[PDB]
Protein backbone atom coordinates (compact mmCIF):
# COMPACT_ATOMS: atom_id res chain seq x y z
CA UNK A 1 0.00 0.00 0.00
CA UNK A 2 3.00 2.36 0.41
CA UNK A 3 2.13 5.68 2.08
CA UNK A 4 -1.40 6.07 0.69
CA UNK A 5 -4.76 5.89 2.48
CA UNK A 6 -7.61 4.75 0.23
CA UNK A 7 -10.27 6.31 2.46
CA UNK A 8 -8.52 9.69 2.45
CA UNK A 9 -7.95 9.56 -1.31
CA UNK A 10 -11.63 8.76 -1.83
CA UNK A 11 -12.78 11.52 0.53
CA UNK A 12 -10.60 14.17 -1.14
CA UNK A 13 -12.40 13.93 -4.49
CA UNK A 14 -15.97 15.21 -5.04
CA UNK A 15 -19.10 13.06 -5.15
CA UNK A 16 -19.24 12.16 -8.85
CA UNK A 17 -15.53 11.33 -8.91
CA UNK A 18 -16.03 9.16 -5.82
CA UNK A 19 -18.89 7.30 -7.48
CA UNK A 20 -17.01 6.67 -10.72
CA UNK A 21 -13.85 5.57 -8.91
CA UNK A 22 -15.85 3.11 -6.80
CA UNK A 23 -17.66 1.79 -9.88
CA UNK A 24 -14.31 1.19 -11.57
CA UNK A 25 -12.91 -0.47 -8.45
CA UNK A 26 -15.83 -2.91 -8.35
CA UNK A 27 -16.06 -3.37 -12.13
CA UNK A 28 -14.58 -6.86 -11.68
CA UNK A 29 -17.70 -8.06 -9.87
CA UNK A 30 -20.15 -5.77 -11.67
CA UNK A 31 -19.37 -6.79 -15.25
CA UNK A 32 -18.93 -10.48 -14.43
CA UNK A 33 -21.74 -11.55 -12.11
CA UNK A 34 -24.98 -12.15 -14.08
CA UNK A 35 -27.16 -10.83 -11.24
CA UNK A 36 -25.95 -7.28 -11.96
CA UNK A 37 -26.59 -7.28 -15.73
CA UNK A 38 -29.97 -5.54 -15.28
CA UNK A 39 -28.74 -2.67 -13.07
CA UNK A 40 -29.51 0.99 -13.69
CA UNK A 41 -27.05 3.83 -13.14
CA UNK A 42 -28.48 4.96 -9.80
CA UNK A 43 -28.57 1.52 -8.19
CA UNK A 44 -25.15 0.65 -9.61
CA UNK A 45 -23.63 3.77 -8.05
CA UNK A 46 -25.50 3.28 -4.76
CA UNK A 47 -24.06 -0.24 -4.55
CA UNK A 48 -20.53 0.71 -5.62
CA UNK A 49 -20.50 3.31 -2.84
CA UNK A 50 -20.96 0.59 -0.19
CA UNK A 51 -18.95 -2.29 -1.70
Amino acid sequence: SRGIDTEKVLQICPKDMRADICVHLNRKVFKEHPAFRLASDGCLRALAMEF
Binding site: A35, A46, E50
Partner: protein
Protein backbone atom coordinates in the same frame (compact mmCIF):
# COMPACT_ATOMS: atom_id res chain seq x y z
CA UNK B 1 -33.94 -9.71 1.78
CA UNK B 2 -35.92 -12.95 2.21
CA UNK B 3 -34.88 -14.20 5.67
CA UNK B 4 -35.05 -10.79 7.42
CA UNK B 5 -33.26 -12.25 10.44
CA UNK B 6 -29.74 -13.06 11.62
CA UNK B 7 -28.40 -16.60 11.93
CA UNK B 8 -25.32 -18.21 13.42
CA UNK B 9 -22.65 -19.33 10.97
CA UNK B 10 -22.64 -23.11 10.70
CA UNK B 11 -19.14 -23.64 9.27
CA UNK B 12 -15.69 -22.08 9.18
CA UNK B 13 -14.26 -20.49 6.04
CA UNK B 14 -10.50 -20.47 5.54
CA UNK B 15 -8.26 -18.85 2.96
CA UNK B 16 -6.02 -20.97 0.74
CA UNK B 17 -4.39 -18.56 -1.74
CA UNK B 18 -3.97 -14.78 -1.77
CA UNK B 19 -7.63 -13.88 -2.34
CA UNK B 20 -9.58 -10.68 -2.91
CA UNK B 21 -13.02 -10.33 -1.34
CA UNK B 22 -15.79 -7.81 -2.02
CA UNK B 23 -18.02 -7.77 1.06
CA UNK B 24 -21.22 -5.75 1.50
CA UNK B 25 -23.07 -5.28 4.78
CA UNK B 26 -26.65 -6.47 5.11
CA UNK B 27 -28.24 -3.14 6.07
CA UNK B 28 -26.99 -1.13 3.09
CA UNK B 29 -27.87 -3.90 0.64
CA UNK B 30 -31.37 -4.19 2.10
CA UNK B 31 -31.87 -0.42 1.96
CA UNK B 32 -30.74 -0.13 -1.66
CA UNK B 33 -32.76 -3.20 -2.69
CA UNK B 34 -35.94 -1.89 -1.04
CA UNK B 35 -35.39 1.50 -2.69
CA UNK B 36 -35.03 -0.13 -6.13
CA UNK B 37 -38.04 -2.46 -6.19
CA UNK B 38 -37.75 -3.05 -9.94
CA UNK B 39 -34.09 -3.98 -9.52
CA UNK B 40 -34.93 -6.27 -6.60
CA UNK B 41 -37.60 -8.14 -8.57
CA UNK B 42 -34.82 -9.43 -10.84
CA UNK B 43 -31.96 -9.54 -8.33
CA UNK B 44 -33.82 -12.05 -6.15
CA UNK B 45 -34.59 -14.23 -9.17
CA UNK B 46 -31.09 -14.12 -10.65
CA UNK B 47 -28.81 -14.34 -7.58
CA UNK B 48 -28.21 -17.93 -6.43
CA UNK B 49 -25.74 -18.57 -3.62
CA UNK B 50 -22.98 -21.13 -4.03
CA UNK B 51 -23.02 -22.07 -0.33
Amino acid sequence: WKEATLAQSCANVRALTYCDLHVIKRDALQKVLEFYTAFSHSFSRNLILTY
